[PDB]
Amino acid sequence: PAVGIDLGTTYSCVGVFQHGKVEIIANDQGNRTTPSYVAFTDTERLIGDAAKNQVAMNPTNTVFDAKRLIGRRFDDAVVQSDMKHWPFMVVNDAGRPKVQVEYKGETKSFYPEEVSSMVLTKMKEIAEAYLGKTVTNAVVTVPAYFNDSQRQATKDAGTIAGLNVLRIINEPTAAAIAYGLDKKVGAERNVLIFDLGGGTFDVSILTIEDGIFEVKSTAGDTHLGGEDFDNRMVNHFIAEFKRKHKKDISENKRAVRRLRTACERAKRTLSSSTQASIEIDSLYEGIDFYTSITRARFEELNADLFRGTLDPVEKALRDAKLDKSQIHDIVLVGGSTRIPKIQKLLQDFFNGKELNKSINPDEAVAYGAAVQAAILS
Template sequence: MQKFSFSRIEEGQIGIGVDFGTSNSSVAIFDGKELRCLTIEEGDHALKLIPTAIYISKDLLPTIGLSGIEQYLQDNRNRQIKLKQESVGAFDMTLGFGGDGDAQTITVQANAWTDQNIPGRLFRGIKSWLGNSDVDRVKIFNKSFNITALITPILLKLKETYSPFAESKIDIHVGRPVNFVGDSQESNRQAISRLTDSCRFAEIKNPIFCEEPVAAAMSFLHTHSVEVDSKYLVFDFGGGTLDLTVLSITQNGFSVLATGGIGLGGNMIDCMIYKKMIFPEIGLGVKVSRNANAKQEKTDFRFSDYAERLIDWQNAYQLNTPRLRNQINVGMKEGGEAEIKLKRLRGIIVDNLSYEILRAIESAKIELSNQTETIISVPGIDLEVPFTRQDFDEILKAPLKDIDTLLSDVLSKANVSKDELTGVVCTGGSSEIPAIRNHLEALLHIPIIRHDAFTGIAAGLAIANYYGYDSSST
């Protein structure tokens, strides 16, 4: 059991917290009295919360945050994709057995399509890669970079933000999920190792990793009066993970009774919306003709050739090959609905619009937090899809089952029943979804407290840093 006490600290101390999130990042400082989130991007934006994004130009120069996203969109607007087939090496292939019983092996040259006109690469959600052993290096303009090389410039930007307040301070609290995407001891070990390396390269010399829902609890308790011995569930639902913590309030602090987390977040939900609401409007289920036994028969358009790459927007340009374009062009000859929908698919591929579709989905999802219906609008392909809360609730049925399972597990670990909870502290952008809050309220029958959805974790990390909280020593 982890215990924490808001013990008095001598004046002059300062706490610094860095929330490197899957979707967004923020930085906060705390001097024992005033809690402040710092401005990270200056100029026209003046943002205290930036998208966790890095855009690498052809000159290998990084641009961070919203500026990086805007540069990516500007560089790719109306850009023509020019694919070229290039050799990526050779490998041996065993075909079977010859007449003498020996295996026959041939050497095959492997080729891949590359975009010769690509002005830069945008990366988002890199935090989700940290625990994935299959993702070690990324090729950018014929140069190979490891994952830490992509994360380091983002952390450098965050360090530049707090450096004027840090003086000689070495220990900085950095957030981490209970379980990184991968949900295993090995993925957690690897993720922390990679994140530690990135911090070191960014000259964050001694990062102290604090579980994000525990940090959220600290910022909540800083701003709310609660009764001793009351118990709270912290529900931290962000872009990449869902993290839960059960707290028991003590005289001058709290005890962490249990934590738990899974790889479920807003990014995954966005992809589910893409598949459910957009795929049917860009070719899924379209019938096209084929010549079978001299008869014209209808068959499903091979949308599966495109589906996964459309979701993987960072590599969606690889769909712009002669074979896949020709398959679309042939299907468009059907006319009618098939032509309309496949023309949209062609537009997404030729103009590299898959990321813009995901942005439109995210915007529509946010709008449904305050209204019952909206439109997923992508003007570039003449697409407007009505999207209602009822549609969204249907999509969320599977994630809600995962939430119920995790909640049951964490309460069991804490040896706390639902009836013993005083309230649920909700933080993270995905916790703003009405269906999520309504589900928790119906399940637990206790107050749902909305707490600083986007900067509450950074604030809590600064408080943890100020008081010297270290879960590894409690």
């Protein structure tokens, strides 16, 4: 029983191909995606939903974004810039970066691939709970721009977790496999992947010749995702609360966190409804916060971020020596592509060409990895 695992920057996903169909496996809370969070307390180690739910109460020991550190050295310019926004420590150990936290009263340090192995261990256990069998073989996906060092450190994360990594494949290639684009018998196919996720945005252009994949160009934004859309909503409601009650809640970490989760939940509703309501009891100094927001207002708060996503698309087309009319298939990947304004922008950019989106975009990477896992097993 081989599984396909998407090891995401913010959310991870595991699937299994069996009986001619792919099953995306939900976790113990019923979620088909699991946050890439690891928390350390004085009693136990929390992974996934349980780790993210207590980040406000234990910020210095809750580790996330380990994918940004994996396969890199401490002297990397990206590593030094990212650690300026993390509440946890990142120390140097013979040139390698290590996260340092407090666990069971003592100090412990972990390499990035060790943190990712804990996430893979959770995805391994999520699959075993549904399958009722022991899971050993797996295909793990990585971004197309990952080098050998980053691909090897991801493979080591699977080995530490007890998995036998059958093959490391690219995330956009896995998305194209999910839609069977490599099985369309015909001429050469140019495929563009539009992957807008939690904190990252990746555009990839692939070429399928005789079922063989080739990465032609990559572009995007390493710090653009659904979290930036949530922050725009948070600042919107913070100013609204200050306007109504003459009080600023910015310095209350718990209040800001509770408002941020309500904004994220309201954002998901705005993809399927034209409005959503915020309901928080005793947000700040005993004052309840009951309001709403329309889809139009959500789009206006992110008009500059939404339309800016087409700049990497034009850059990827230009790097691949291709006109937009030369694209044969367009694939939507990442949970943020459920936003109707995002889909409208990309379809208008391609002059009304239909988009591949029937598969849940935050599950398409794990979907294709599961198909590849069954082929290689």
